[PDB]
Amino acid sequence: VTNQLQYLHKVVMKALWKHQFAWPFRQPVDAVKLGLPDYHKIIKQPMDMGTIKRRLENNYYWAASECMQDFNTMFTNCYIYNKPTDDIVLMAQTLEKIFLQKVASMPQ
């Protein structure tokens, strides 16, 4: 495992997974459970932290940028789908700011 992917796993995912605002993002969006019948009409590439974490655990990624794009898709899906005023947007913004702060110190 590259230095970069080790960092994404040990530093970035570690910080984000345990965060108090992480829970809406720890599993795929369940549109039935959440009452969101248009979710998959709007969001064509669902992504969540559970998936990213499993991919890090299973050496799915070849480059760190690939993992970073998955985090990015997760956050962007939230901004695109939700109303600007929804609390979930605030939660995503908070997590993404940590993501970027940590990525500023990633190797290589």
* Residues of this chain that bind ligand BUX (CB under 6 A): 24-25, 29, 34, 36, 78, 81-82, 88
Dihedral sign from CA coordinates of 12, 10, 4, 78: negative
Whether the CB-CB separation of 8 and 64 falls below 8 Å is answered with yes
Dihedral sign from CA coordinates of 39, 41, 42, 47: positive
The binder of 63, among ligand BUX, a second copy, none, by C-beta within 5 to 8 A per type, is a second copy
Q: Is 38 annotated as a binding residue?
A: yes
Q: Exactly one of 42, 50, 54, 59 binds a second copy (CB under 8 A); which one?
A: 42
Alpha-carbon span 77 to 14, nearest angstrom: 21
Q: Which residues bind a second copy (CB under 8 A)?
A: 4, 42, 63-65, 68-69, 72, 75-76, 79-81, 84, 89, 93, 96-97, 100-101, 103-108
